[PDB]
């Protein structure tokens, strides 16, 4: 994990025993396992810290492409395009005067 | 290994499908009904089980039932 590289991540057993500062000069952070699939680990601060904690989610173009490949998005896009095409045909050639 | 013996067809198993013969009581319970029992001092009880000489309802349908089985089809061992 690149986000926490250079951070001193102490287990709860070592809390207070380790006081070495981080690469960013922050104090060590206590890491705990939560047994939650959504948040497997949570970190607490031993003191005031100056560190980057991104709130944006990690989204990959491959993941987005897989989600759109899901049959629902594929067929919904197909049906939306078809409905738009029929509506535009009705707009451009109303009343079927050619027939 | 079932002690029950089928009355209708000895080769087959008993319809009950049990393996231990029933236990008869020392004295069978006698027919009773729940009624009031005025206490003779102004009191009165609500559900007092009191003896009843015969069937509470003498209909043939009621009296034909012996409780031996679903159709009273269990042999003498049922009692």
């Amino acid at each position: 994990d690149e986000r926490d590289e250079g951070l001193v991540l102490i287990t709860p057993e070592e809390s207070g025993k380790v006081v070495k500062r981080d690469v960013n000069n922050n104090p060590p952070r206590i890491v705990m396992k939560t047994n939650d699939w959504d948040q497997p680990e949570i970190q607490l601060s031993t003191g005031a810290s100056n560190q980057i904690n991104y709130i944006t989610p990690v989204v990959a173009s491959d993941d987005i492409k897989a989600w759109l490949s899901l049959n629902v998005n594929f067929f919904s896009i197909l049906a939306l395009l078809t409905v738009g095409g029929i509506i535009e045909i009705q707009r451009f050639f109303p009343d079927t005067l050619y027939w | 290994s079932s002690k029950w013996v089928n009355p209708e067809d000895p080769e087959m198993s008993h319809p009950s499908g049990l393996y231990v013969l029933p236990l008869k009581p020392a004295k069978p319970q006698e027919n009773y009904i729940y009624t009031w029992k005025k206490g003779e001092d102004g009191s009165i009880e609500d559900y007092v089980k009191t003896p009843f000489k015969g069937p509470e309802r003498a209909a043939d349908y009621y009296t034909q039932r012996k409780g031996n089985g679903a159709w009273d089809h269990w042999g003498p061992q049922g009692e």
């Binding site: - | 049990l18 393996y19 319970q29 729940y34």
Partner: protein, 121 residues
């Protein structure tokens, strides 16, 4: 080899130490209109809270406990719950109108799911 318990008629056994501590409800058997009963007797190492098949909850005595119901279905459901609690000594009896006691559920003393010798299809 199996011994059938006395299991006195519920109308005769008004108060017994065996009966577990339960709340009571209108879901119990109708005493005025029915006479056939089913008794379930088990032994518990500790008082575990359990749900009566007839309405509310109950607390089983440490030692011998006895309960009365109207249907083998109620007795068997309570027995399944006891088995979940790891009480394997429970027995079920059918009580006729006249007091005859018929040992029913562990018919041969071995639970039906477990194979036993002397059983024929």
């Amino acid at each position: 080899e199996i011994v059938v318990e006395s299991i006195p008629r519920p109308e005769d056994l008004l108060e017994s130490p065996k009966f577990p501590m339960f709340e009571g409800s209108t879901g119990g058997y109708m005493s005025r209109s029915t006479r056939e009963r089913h008794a379930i007797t088990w032994t518990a190492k500790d008082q575990n809270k359990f749900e009566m098949p007839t309405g509310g909850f109950a607390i089983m005595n440490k030692g011998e406990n006895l309960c009365y119901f109207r249907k083998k279905e109620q007795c068997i459901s309570l027995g399944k719950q006891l088995r979940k609690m790891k009480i394997e000594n429970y027995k079920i009896y059918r009580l006729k109108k006249d007091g005859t006691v018929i040992f029913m559920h562990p018919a041969d003393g071995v639970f039906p799911e477990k194979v036993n010798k002397g059983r024929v299809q």
